[PDB]
Amino acid sequence: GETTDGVYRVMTRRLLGSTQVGVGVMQEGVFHTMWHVTKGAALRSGEGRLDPYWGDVKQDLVSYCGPWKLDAAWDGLSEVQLLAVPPGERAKNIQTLPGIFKTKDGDIGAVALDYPAGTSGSPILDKCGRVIGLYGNGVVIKNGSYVSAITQGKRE
């Protein structure tokens, strides 16, 4: 199939037409997405097949063809870019300064940008183009706006 590094759409043919359920990141031959996008199911890339390799529902992450490769982290100070890939729309970079999710187990960066559910899995980048996490697991605030955690896995 297609194994080049980059951002990819995740599609299904089970609902009306072809529906974009999410997005992911190919890096070093491994596909990275949010667990809620695929529920751990196998994927197709042209004539090839990607099988799940690692996943965790609490972290809301899954990798295919190999272990999780993304290890960069938000510095806690600088602006980042969401490389949003919305359903039926061109990939678009949105720059923002993350907020914070404060939890009983530590603080995590959070991005306050309103994109549709099928954008889940889009990568968040630092100034060197490294992926610091995926957008698409968070909370809906008071008026209906959305705030996503910057969700990152662990590279063993």
Binding site: L43, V85, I100, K102, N137, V139, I141
Partner: protein, 39 residues
């Protein structure tokens, strides 16, 4: 059956639209991976 299609290179863009605030929110994360607002 799910499938993937390439949508771009992962690069930082100098002319990106800049927007969004930076809220500080107290949250809880449950065993099912759902976040919820705590107050």
């Amino acid at each position: 059956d799910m499938y993937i299609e390439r949508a771009g290179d992962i690069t930082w863009e100098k002319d990106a639209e800049v927007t969004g605030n930076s809220p500080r929110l107290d949250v809880a994360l449950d065993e099912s991976g759902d976040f919820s607002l705590v107050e």
